[model samples]
Target: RKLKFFFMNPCEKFWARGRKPWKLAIQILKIAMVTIQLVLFGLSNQMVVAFKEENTIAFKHLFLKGYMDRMDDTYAVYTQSDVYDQLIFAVNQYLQLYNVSVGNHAYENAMAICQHFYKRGNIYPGNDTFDIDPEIETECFFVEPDNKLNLTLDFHRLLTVELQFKLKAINLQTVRHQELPDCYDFTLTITFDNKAHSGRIKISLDNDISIRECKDWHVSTHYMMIFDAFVILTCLVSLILCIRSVIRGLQLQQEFVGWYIMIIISDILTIIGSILKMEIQAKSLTSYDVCSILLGTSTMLVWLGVIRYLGFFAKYNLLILTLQAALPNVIRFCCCAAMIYLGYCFCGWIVLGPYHDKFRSLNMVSECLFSLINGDDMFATFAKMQQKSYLVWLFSRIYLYSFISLFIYMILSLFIALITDTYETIKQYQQTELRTFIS
Candidate 1:
């Protein structure tokens, strides 16, 4: 009898029999299917592995010296001497060790380390010697040995420059000392020449000008487009579900009215944000800042709605019910607390206002009071009285005592008591129901 009951499902009746094995099998299958879906979700994020490392080279702005050319007087030109100096030093180091020999020499059997200057044109000009991923077509120039020391400057535009060094084996030693700050816009690429003892060096830099690169990643654009479409589809489905709930007259009875409305608004914002992001990708000139803000706001609102909706389930409803029962008491406590807090704010602004940053404004005073409630440097606030008038110290001490006695000792305890009383009432009701069922 014990063995028969041990494997039996309680949800089945005493008269029902021989179905425990099938129920167990269905439960196991459900768990396995959910586990498989979770694994697939994780693998989808790991699909792209070959990502470009950006801003590997850094340069600091040494200084900008403004100059005027009689030839071109329409625009004011600035020459950054420090940027030019760093470039010169980098190239000089490479040339000095160009012919030297070590165990694995810097430059061994190279025909020449060709350096190219590109203003704004196709970098790969009829030479299939290098394989770079950026297919930017701009004006290209070969830096002659004479102008190798020259810095290019335009009247009213940023000078985009590229250096291609043909090599046998990539001499890491050449760029060993070329460490720049991450704030500067720079990128480095090293491509193998396939033939033994041959490689290529590609370094790009914007001359001392701070420029921002938007949406630079190595992943396929197709994957990004598909992911965006899936999100929009999910949001549209959520809108449909909400509409159905409304049609069924659930909106009037549901305490989740606020949550549902917020979710609907957030979904609309997400769709709009996705469209803006796609437009940004299409038009290279537009920025992604506004799109990012909209998406971020949508995410926060959705998570808030998720938390609110979870309370509808029986398992999690107790805490939500307790809060709802205690809400009137909480509101009364908050109103009293706000009045006391505002009094403190005004007092601090009047007395110790000039001496300390904390007492300089009403906002700062409120922040100090909030921190004090959490036990943050209460004595430090008292010490601020030492710097100002001795008379002001009396009001300060009064403020502290009133805050501690009212907010901490009295009001908070009352708030806790309200929640506990509501919880006990709920427990009693459950107990009564259990007793009736047993009888």
Candidate 2:
């Protein structure tokens, strides 16, 4: 009977079959799989962020050379002169790495230079490899920033670190990814080839990066994307199921009032997120923010949806019912609280802003108010009123005292009354409701 009752969703009441039992384990498995997928993405995303952040710091330290010690040498502080100095210093340091050439006959020299360097590795000694001649015949060369001349490169050589910035001058707001608009879009590409094993790294000007170890490794790490494909297919399957439910729901006059709507919406969001995350790995999309939003929304709701299953029990059902009953009143109360909150925020920003650190802006004022409402840092806010303007100081005294008393006493008490009354009502009526709910 318990198992039979558990498949509230699996009922074919509208779909025409009644006894087709659905296993709760299957729904549990969806949560389990989604959890694993979410955790993997979190790890991969963290590693990506960490790698890029570290490299950007390293780039500043290596190229900028002694700039990190400054108390004031921020992005604005780094002028063209600073960048030029760094460029010169970097070019000087990189001269040795790419300073190989072919003067009409040193093609032999060029091939020997790379070949002699990587001739041997051993299975018994340490590793296993025989360095065969490379497929692509190429040599390292550096081009100065924005020098798009002499592009032919069958037998190429250069004395340089890299293809430098395309800049007559570096502009602050122009280079970053569109989502991460403030960061400069300077990036360094690193590729490695060791016999058959090779990989690439892309580090950005700001903190975002990626790794692809052989184009094949991009598809194969525990065969990573293989699992991603599974995750996508799993969520995609759930999405279609939800869509069918929605179709049947409309015919039956059902809607978002039930929990199944949330399930499908979450599935849809997570599918898009997983898909976007795949593209990032495959080198299609660049914005982490988009991926973050889609995944984050789904995560929040997926956890929240756990409460749906919880509503199967009596005590949990009471809580859900109470919250549902009080939601309208709670929204109305919160709206009223907001206008008062904003009134205080604006008033404090303009008047006490000069004297108090907490009220310097609308954001700080909001924080201060929230902090005060929660009974945090009371003395800090009240004590910081500078007496340069006694009138404003007097206003601060009124503002703090009034807001505290009104919100903390009257509004908060009423807020509790709204929920408590609703809770008591559900607590009283839930037994018979459970009888009906279960039956």
Candidate 3:
């Protein structure tokens, strides 16, 4: 599925080992376009999903066709649109979130059904008992064997919107035992006693594909772009600092200053190298490239700086104060390293398992390679064996919080150690000065 094309004429070391300039340039352009398109389309997709609807209720409404075909338009069974609205209003007002309390203490539910073309011999006023006027309420209450009437009473109240209900039929009652005859011309009426609103509501049914896909592409693209921009910015700033350091190195006379300048430059280069590698698109990475880069650099700096400082003390054993200064750092580094290594090997998977797989794997690799090292995301392989579920999120959240607290504690401990060592070192200097003055 993947193809690699190379220029054939250059078999030399430069051409063979190096990335071709033209190829790199072309690839960069393509990556830019793809990133933009993916983001835009992803956003559209999300919008579509928000609006897309299923036809489950529409199918039920179409079932009224059989009754319609058997009767004329005037005396036909009519399902009022208000019935749908009332049912939805009733249901939504019932289901509420645990902490949400609706104090409306009013039960607003009413329903009525009317039969058209019933008891119609002379079409006169006062047919049997009640006054039946054709011009008054329409000539609906008069039809022979094929006419029936049914009324329903709905007594539903509100608690939450999640409990919203739907209307299956105009005159079809949910609790009724007797079935209606096929020739009944029915009308359904629903009323709500809620003084808060005038009418009922129903969830709209519609399908949208483009908008949904676009939204997804949009979010992915934004995340990817920020990651790319970060890589470039980090690279540019580091490059400038290196150039400045080289210029300063040329002017410094002292060997210590020269080495110090070079050390600073080398450390900067090391940081840039780490950043580039971490932020650059890998075969698997999808997001959080910044987090990956930061965590990697911080872990490495914390451990290696301590290592370098201890080595500094070991070489210059002349200063007792120096030994005192380095001892706590060495211990702290050991403890922190042990925690990082152990946590990654054992508990990190629980924290990382719930994240986006590709991104999480990148984090795992960065965490490991930089001395929080646990094996370069190899553990992530087993994670693919399972499917996404709520458990992953729950475990991950707990793990992340724990990791953050651990990092904070480690930093505070290091600060305390440094402060204590500096105080002792300064006291030693003051004592030496006093002895020299007295002599």
Candidate 4:
């Protein structure tokens, strides 16, 4: 009789022929892999189908309903998820068809979605949702990016002169930095989420700019935007003064008290100017040049004082005096460090160079520097701190304990020695006087 077995099996003997366990295991693994792949492929096919069938109306219905379910009001756009993101995200998903090796049915479906969404792009207004990840309805989170809402602006009718809107997103291809006090130029950050992409439109009541928020552009806010230029100009003047003070302080060497104080004065003015988010209005304003002159003159004098200290008074170890004499600078440095750390985590920081030329990242250092000057150190969030905890700790430890502490201790010792020398000189004078009396 011919030997028959399920898998060429031979049981109950060492020499009996049988399928190897190793081969069996390999077969089992292959079966499992295939099953998983089938399931994933099925899901992907369904996604392609749903998209092909205008199921975005469905996907969008679900997500949009979810949004409505979270919020009672439909009027407020989830600005972050506005039209651009909605369309782009969908477009991005549909493009996956080109990368994936799909069945004919799935391929056809993906092509339909790609074509339909692309053509529909002209109709979709960009997502109003300016926020990246916003908290919607309760603590539940949505992990999807919407890409159905892409809109275009007809720039021919409006914005003939290129006025900037600090608090709002700019119209596409709108001219920026074109003229003096353009709407695009602003410093008060009203829309926190858009601070980097959009400029500020904050109005200072003290500066006589009224407070308002609306969808349409108005002459009043435009006026505020122009006024901001004057304030920025004022800040530039203060910075100049500080720069001069630094220069003069370096020149004075040993006697740098004047320059030190001058720098402090400049720092004070800068702090004040930053606080007053002034909106300078009226084309009739001729006082801007005069204001610059006044501020510049005083600032220049202060810088001259710095030169006197650097050239004459800074005779000893300059580092010691830097710690002892430049107490304000040390404090300012510390405060700025702390503020920058906080800003990086929660608030946005400004960046320069290549990265600045591109979209600003969460780690922009200039953001921290500005926040530090504003003294609103907590303007940033704990999330930012958590992300950069290791770096912040490392830098802070080096700056505060290692560098700052060491410098202070050394300066204190030097001051003590100087006090003793002064006492000795007084004693010598008294001794000479006593000898003269005895004679």
State each model's C-alpha RMSD to the native: 18.3, 18.4, 26.1, 35.1
Write down the worst ten-residue block by lDDT for model 4. 108-117
Candidate 4 has a TM-score of: 0.22
List model 4 lDDT by residue over 170-259, tens digit each.
222122322122122111111112212233211111111121222344442354234333333444444444455455455444332343
lDDT of each: 0.45, 0.54, 0.36, 0.33
Where model 3 places Cα greater than 4 Å from the true spot, the runs are: 1-324, 331-342, 357-359, 362-390, 432-439
* Residue-wise C-alpha lDDT for candidate 3, range 220-255, written one tens digit per residue: 144534543454344344334444445544433232
lDDT of 2 by residue, 1-439 (tens): 3532433433234235443434345555667778888787676555445544554565444444344455543322123344334444544433322342111111101100111122232223255543443333344454432122223221112111123321111222222221111222334432211222212111123323333222221111436577777877877876766666576466436422357688878988888877887766555344565777788688777777777666643334666778889899899888977898888888777776666672156687778788988898688977665677777778778878988879767877988898889888887775567447657
In angstroms, the error of model 4 at 102 is 64
| Strongest candidate by lDDT | 2
lDDT of 3 at 388: 65
Task: Arrange candidates, best lDDT first.
Answer: 2, 1, 3, 4
Please give, for residues 242-353, the per-residue lDDT of candidate 1 as tens digits. 4543442363444224555766666666667556556654543312446666755766666565455454333446666677767887888789778877886676677645
lDDT of 4 at 130: 32
Per-candidate TM-scores read: 0.45, 0.60, 0.21, 0.22
Q: What TM-score, to 2 decimals, does candidate 1 have?
A: 0.45
Better of 2 and 4 by TM-score: 2
- Report how far residue 150 has shifted in candidate 3, in Å: 71
